[PDB]
Design an enzyme around this catalytic site. Structure first.
Site, PDB file in Angstrom:
ATOM      1  CG  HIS A  15     -17.023  40.361  -4.729  1.00  0.00           C
ATOM      2  ND1 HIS A  15     -16.854  40.719  -3.398  1.00  0.00           N
ATOM      3  CD2 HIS A  15     -18.095  41.128  -4.851  1.00  0.00           C
ATOM      4  CE1 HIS A  15     -17.812  41.612  -2.866  1.00  0.00           C
ATOM      5  NE2 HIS A  15     -18.549  41.877  -4.003  1.00  0.00           N
TER       6      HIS A  15
ATOM      7  CG  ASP B 291     -11.159  43.021   0.003  1.00  0.00           C
ATOM      8  OD1 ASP B 291      -9.945  43.742  -0.481  1.00  0.00           O
ATOM      9  OD2 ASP B 291     -11.536  43.533   1.229  1.00  0.00           O
TER      10      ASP B 291
ATOM     11  CG  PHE C 211     -11.817  48.307   1.855  1.00  0.00           C
ATOM     12  CD1 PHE C 211     -12.466  48.963   2.613  1.00  0.00           C
ATOM     13  CD2 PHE C 211     -12.407  47.101   1.305  1.00  0.00           C
ATOM     14  CE1 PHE C 211     -13.668  48.491   3.242  1.00  0.00           C
ATOM     15  CE2 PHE C 211     -13.740  46.595   1.674  1.00  0.00           C
ATOM     16  CZ  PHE C 211     -14.390  47.297   2.569  1.00  0.00           C
TER      17      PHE C 211
ATOM     18  CD  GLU D  94     -16.601  38.397   5.139  1.00  0.00           C
ATOM     19  OE1 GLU D  94     -16.538  39.455   5.028  1.00  0.00           O
ATOM     20  OE2 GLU D  94     -16.468  37.623   4.301  1.00  0.00           O
TER      21      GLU D  94
ATOM     22  CD  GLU E   7     -14.039  37.047  -2.978  1.00  0.00           C
ATOM     23  OE1 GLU E   7     -13.416  36.824  -2.114  1.00  0.00           O
ATOM     24  OE2 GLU E   7     -14.592  38.174  -3.059  1.00  0.00           O
TER      25      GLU E   7
HETATM   26  O1  LIG Z   1     -17.711  40.836   2.495  1.00  0.00           O
HETATM   27  C1  LIG Z   1     -16.457  41.138   2.511  1.00  0.00           C
HETATM   28  O2  LIG Z   1     -16.094  42.242   3.272  1.00  0.00           O
HETATM   29  C2  LIG Z   1     -14.786  42.605   3.321  1.00  0.00           C
HETATM   30  C3  LIG Z   1     -14.481  43.930   3.625  1.00  0.00           C
HETATM   31  O3  LIG Z   1     -13.300  44.305   3.950  1.00  0.00           O
HETATM   32  C4  LIG Z   1     -13.588  41.619   2.622  1.00  0.00           C
HETATM   33  O4  LIG Z   1     -13.948  42.252   1.222  1.00  0.00           O
HETATM   34  C5  LIG Z   1     -14.240  40.057   2.396  1.00  0.00           C
HETATM   35  O5  LIG Z   1     -13.143  39.310   1.872  1.00  0.00           O
HETATM   36  C6  LIG Z   1     -15.658  39.825   1.926  1.00  0.00           C
HETATM   37  O6  LIG Z   1     -16.109  38.680   2.031  1.00  0.00           O
HETATM   38 MG   LIG Z   2     -14.967  40.070  -2.106  1.00  0.00          MG
HETATM   39 NA    NA Z   3     -10.895  44.389   3.123  1.00  0.00          NA
END
Ligand SMILES: O=C1O[C@H](CO)[C@H](O)[C@H](O)[C@H]1O
Ligand SMILES: [Mg+2]
Ligand code: NA
Ligand SMILES: [Mg+2]
Ligand SMILES: [Mg+2]
Ligand code: NA
Ligand code: NA
Ligand code: NA
Ligand code: NA
Lengths: 1015, 210
Positions: A410, A193, A593, A529, A408
């Site tokens: 995702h 991201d 975002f 996170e 990653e």
């Molecule tokens: O889980 C997550 O949430 C964040 C949202 O900004 C971002 O996407 C990070 O890279 C991801 O690991």
């Molecule tokens: Mg991600």
């Molecule tokens: Na983000």
């Protein structure tokens, strides 16, 4: 052959002719240069001006470019991302891949960057030894030619690719040709991201090694039970011709003092039936009472590895910083040097608003300084191996590092589609194994990570075990597949809440307190996170830290994240502004975002940073009568650069202050007895503030740095002496349309059609541009909007609930407006109903009492229908005519603070310029609130009570209508929002309702009172 | 000095309005020079016979959080039944009210007293919007208890069989009431969210005849 093989659409081919990965080399030919880490003549930088041409596909590249500079090519700085020079658009997408999901294929329209360099190579480099080129970072794949001949190929954007150029170079002028492909089969493993960019974005260098060379070395440090003795073990590998006269010496230095040394010929111990490694040796050095490495005290030794002949002729030297530290999980706790860590961590992307993903030393140092100054002790390399200097800086400044593989996936469906597929195991393995081979000697790296958001596949299990086997000194973690799989030593959830469960099918996020004690669970929990810091956020941050402190196996987490990924664009006048997804014509995109940071892109702090600093404090305080108890949360250091400043103030007025030196052992307590405090004359609340000050400068802070603070209410003496009643009497003037109150030359006008205070006059001067009206709405925060992807209209989000309930459309209906004369005052009584299409949302009942002292006492009682979504606020608003320079208040400050994010704020008398009462979030929203305010002063006005307020030149309406801060225009006069009550901001995540129940305005009936007067 | 504190009058004024009489009062409760509480009230009596009481209390931050914030009186009426719209039918307190249901309840007066063998504060009902006793009606959002026993008698008496019905009916109407606790009975057990620690408290009541 190159166009025919399409190696960039084959996950089986991640490289051609690439050299083995290894720790940082410089091939010193002077041992003292190795010891002191001076530059090496054998390591040359090729950074600077290169030639660049952009093509839409690799098929569009002319053959002549391999041998001759293109006349249409530009001259550009390398390292760079070519999007930052405007050749094509950077793309911001979160989860959805920027390319069609068709693995291993990429678009035929594949932006191709043709980099070239003409450079000199001296004959001495070619007459003997090996000359290699090192590309520290190329995104996402590339072919390399030298003097027209093809050398090789490389994938993985985030680790160095090295190639032996010895047979390709000539004495004098040489030309490199580098074809960089934006998309490759590697891009399937690079769905982070973040902005999607490309090019030669990290350093390029040339390294000369002798034919007989140090090809690898590993340093381990092991300890006895009390850490009073260590063995440094150094395994050394060579390439080239083995001879009996060859030797390896490893010497260990503390500053300029050699503390240990060992010498041996090559030839390892017997390993199996076939003997041992003839081309390796292990040196073991005993170290008594080593100075231990931590983020608290980053003690470093220097290890020098010399390849030499028996008679003392040096061949070459390599070296590294050594930190004596042990990392282990025992009895469910992560221990460093035998003590349980508390991770005050943050995720940090490599991002620069001007240079994109090119990192420089100055930005890196700036980040580390700000991190340490704000009580962080740990960083996660989200989500790739970093620029190699990062680890050197973490070693030396002292931060715990989670080093993470560049994996990653995702956007895959399901998330483990590739990682469970043995066909993708070779490509994934290189991303893990080459990271370990590169970074395993850095003491700052304490934990390995297998990547992020790639579900849980069999490939993760294989690679988890590979690391456990190759490097037992560091735990391995990985969040995918539910945060507690067999591929992780640490329960490492993302955005799991403190008390509230989120029981998603297959991958639930349990309350972190609950997660620890699930049947059979024993591991430590450290959130990889948490506390998503998007816009006006970090609500509930204190809740995490209370739990971290209470529960031994809750050992902290990494905030998401450090720095806004905003980029700079320019208007027609050349004024820079902050851009986010979509602003470059990139589509699809995920808008704002990309901006989740505690700091703005230029490293200016968001208000949330001070909340983090306060909650992550290393000193804890309790008060009992006269006694302050100070508890140290340091594990290793005494408080030998700390003094406690204390001050007692009555409603902002200093009464007493003093200093006491702090002398607290790690984990210890100190008791501080405050002197007898003289009782204050006047009424009011006494407040005690303590601050921990660092008198001496450090590597990471200036003298006078404040590291910790806390406040307590002391004695309160309630005001009982009723103020001497003034002789003046206000008069009521009644017309059909208005109730007018007159006192001397002051006028208060209440409109009888609307039921609001519509105007006030001081003589001939107007006070209001808009009537004083109830307000129940806020310009929605990023947490109110609650989407992680741009295309989702989410009915569960707070903003959507408010919109659908008619909160933003609610019209006031007057129920009652009366006026009465009292003996010494005029009393105005009003009631209003706010309704949406027949449904009553809120009822507001008010009394305004204007007395002979010219004070207007407003009493407000609000009913909120139980079946309407809880309102964002309960307050009043008006546009004041005045524009004044300063804002003065007795309350929580000085920075922005909200009900669930106000622990860092202190109660005192604050005075700021008006501009500081507005927070310039790139995506505009409700901002600048200050809570627990008893008195506010602005121009000729004073408001007293117990309220929250914000004050600015921007209406809630403009803020909610404007997508970018640079687009905001100051309005006539000043918009004032005074709230009896304001809803929490939340932030546990920013894609679902995250405001905790105790911070929602759910009581049904609300009372607040204000006094408005001239000062 | 919470049990010893005497009300000291700070203000008592009366104004005639268009269709009402407004009485404004202010009291301070002091103990040996320390102001414990301030109560500020308005009583608005209108032409329909309703008395609207508005109460605003200040509580000194450094005094122990009070057991309740309310009003009490001994009514001359002894009536057979108590009728209320609120939580019930049984005794319930802020930290012990989950079992109680909101509805219209009607009980004999004696059921509004809980005969704990050691007498104490008892019989509270919370979340009450309307209370009816004899000719009287109270409306608002309050907690109440109602019985023939004063708080004073209850605290002075060691055994329930030693209690004696007093002349009228003691009514305690609370804007706010502290939790009862019970995690144990030998240390403070009332959870912070049920302590009356907000410093400033507001409640409003309408008293009329039905
Ligand atoms: O889980 C997550 O949430 C964040 C949202 O900004 C971002 O996407 C990070 O890279 C991801 O690991
Ligand atoms: Mg991600
Ligand atoms: Na983000
Ligand atoms: Mg490939
Ligand atoms: Mg330097
Ligand atoms: Na803990
Ligand atoms: Na000290
Ligand atoms: Na906006
Ligand atoms: Na008793």
């Amino acid at each position: 052959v190159v166009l025919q093989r399409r190696d960039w659409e084959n996950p089986g081919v991640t490289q051609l002719n690439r050299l083995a990965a290894h720790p940082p080399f410089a091939s010193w030919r002077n041992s003292e240069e190795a010891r002191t880490d001076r530059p090496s003549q054998q390591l040359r930088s090729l950074n600077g001006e290169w030639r660049f041409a952009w093509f839409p596909a690799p098929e569009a590249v002319p053959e002549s470019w391999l041998e001759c500079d293109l006349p249409e090519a530009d001259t550009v700085v390398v390292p760079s991302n070519w999007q930052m020079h405007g050749y094509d658009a950077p793309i911001y997408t979160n989860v959805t891949y920027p390319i069609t999901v068709n693995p291993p294929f990429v678009p035929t329209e594949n932006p191709t960057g043709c980099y070239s360099l003409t450079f000199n190579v001296d004959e001495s480099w070619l007459q003997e030894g090996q000359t290699r080129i090192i590309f520290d970072g190329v995104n996402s794949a590339f072919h390399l030619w030298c003097n027209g001949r093809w050398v090789g190929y490389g994938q993985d954007s985030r680790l160095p690719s090295e190639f032996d150029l010895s047979a390709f170079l000539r004495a004098g002028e040489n030309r490199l040709a580098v074809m960089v492909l934006r998309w490759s089969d590697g891009s399937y493993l690079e769905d982070q991201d973040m902005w999607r960019m490309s090019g030669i974005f990290r350093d390029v260098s040339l390294l000369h090694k002798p034919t007989t060379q140090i090809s690898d070395f590993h340093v381990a440090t092991r300890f006895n039970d009390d850490f009073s003795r260590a063995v440094l073990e150094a395994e050394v590998q060579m390439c080239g011709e083995l001879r009996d006269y060859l030797r390896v010496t490893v010497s260990l230095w503390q500053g300029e003092t050699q503390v240990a040394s060992g010498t041996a010929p090559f030839g390892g111990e017997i390993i199996d039936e076939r003997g041992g490694y003839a081309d390796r040796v292990t040196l073991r050095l005993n170290v008594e009472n080593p100075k231990l490495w931590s983020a608290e005290i980053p003690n470093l030794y220097r290890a020098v590895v010399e390849l030499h002949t028996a008679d003392g002729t040096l061949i070459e030297a390599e070296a590294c910083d050594v930190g004596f530290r042990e990392v282990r999980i025992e009895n469910g706790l992560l221990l460093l040097n035998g003590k349980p860590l508390l991770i005050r961590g943050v995720n940090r992307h490599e991002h620069h608003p001007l240079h994109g993903q090119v990192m420089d030393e100055q930005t890196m140092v700036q980040d580390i300084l700000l991190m340490k100054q704000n009580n962080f002790n740990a960083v996660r390399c989200s989500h790739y191996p970093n620029h190699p200097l990062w680890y050197t800086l973490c070693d030396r400044y002292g931060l715990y590092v989670v080093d993470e593989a560049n994996i990653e996936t995702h956007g895959m469906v399901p998330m483990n589609r590739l990682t469970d597929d043995p066909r993708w195991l070779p490509a994934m393995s290189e991303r893990v194994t080459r990271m370990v081979q590169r970074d395993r000697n850095h003491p700052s790296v304490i934990i390995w990570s297998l990547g992020t958001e790639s579900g849980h596949g069999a490939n993760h299990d294989a690679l988890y075990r590979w690391i456990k086997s190759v490097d037992p000194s560091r735990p391995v973690q990985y969040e995918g597949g539910g945060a507690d799989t067999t591929a992780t030593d640490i329960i490492c959830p993302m955005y799991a809440r403190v008390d509230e469960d989120q029981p998603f099918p297959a991958v639930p996020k349990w309350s972190i307190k609950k997660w620890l004690s699930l049947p059979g669970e024993t591991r430590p929990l450290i959130l990889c996170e948490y506390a998503h810091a998007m816009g006006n956020s970090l609500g509930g941050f204190a809740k995490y830290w209370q739990a971290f402190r209470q529960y031994p196996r809750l050992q902290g987490g990494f905030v998401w994240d450090w720095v806004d990924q905003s980029l700079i664009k320019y208007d027609e006048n050349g004024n820079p502004w902050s851009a986010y997804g979509g602003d470059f014509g990139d589509t699809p995109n995920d808008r704002q975002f990309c901006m989740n940071g505690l700091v703005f892109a230029d490293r200016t702090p968001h208000p949330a940073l001070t909340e983090a600093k306060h909650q992550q404090q290393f000193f804890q305080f309790r008060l009992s009568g006269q006694t302050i108890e100070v508890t140290s949360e340091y594990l290793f250091r005494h408080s030998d650069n700390e003094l406690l400043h204390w001050m007692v103030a009555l409603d902002g007025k200093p009464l007493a202050s003093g200093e006491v030196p702090l002398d607290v052992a790690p984990q210890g307590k100190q008791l501080i007895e405050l002197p007898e405090l003289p009782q204050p004359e006047s009424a009011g609340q006494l407040w005690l503030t303590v601050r921990v000050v660092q008198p001496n400068a450090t590597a990471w802070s200036e003298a006078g740095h404040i590291s910790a603070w806390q406040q307590w209410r002391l004695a309160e003496n309630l005001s009982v002496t009723l103020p001497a009643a003034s002789h003046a009497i206000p008069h009521l003037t009644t017309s059909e349309m208005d109730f007018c109150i007159e006192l001397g030359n002051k006028r208060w006008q209440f409109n009888r059609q609307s039921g609001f205070l519509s105007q006030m006059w001081i003589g001939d001067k107007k006070q209001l541009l808009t009537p004083l009206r109830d307000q129940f709405t806020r310009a929605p925060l990023d947490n109110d909007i609650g989407v992680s992807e741009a295309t989702r209209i989410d009915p569960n989000a707070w903003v959507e609930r408010w919109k659908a309930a008619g909160h933003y459309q609610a019209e006031a209906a007057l129920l009652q407006c009366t006026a009465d004369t009292l003996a010494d005052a005029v009393l105005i009584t009003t009631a209003h109903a706010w309704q949406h299409q027949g449904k009553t949302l809120f009822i507001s009942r008010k009394t305004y009492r204007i007395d002979g002292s010219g004070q207007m006492a407003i009493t407000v009682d609000v009913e909120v229908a139980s079946d309407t979504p809880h309102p964002a606020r309960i307050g009043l608003n008006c546009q004041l005519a005045q524009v004044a320079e300063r804002v003065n208040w007795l309350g929580l400050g000085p920075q922005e603070n909200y009900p669930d994010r106000l622990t860092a704020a202190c109660f005192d008398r604050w005075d700021l310029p008006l501009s500081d009462m507005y927070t310039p979030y790139v995506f505009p929203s409700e901002n600048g609130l200050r809570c627990g305010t008893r008195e506010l002063n602005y121009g000729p006005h004073q408001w007293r009570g117990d309220f929250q307020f914000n004050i600015s030149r921007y209406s809630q309406q403009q803020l909610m209508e404007t997508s970018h801060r640079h687009l905001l225009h100051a309005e006539e006069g000043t918009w004032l929002n005074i709230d009896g009550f304001h809803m929490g901001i939340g932030g546990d995540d920013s894609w679902s309702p995250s405001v905790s129940a105790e911070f929602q305005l759910s009581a049904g009936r609300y009372h607040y009172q204000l006094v408005w007067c001239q000062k």
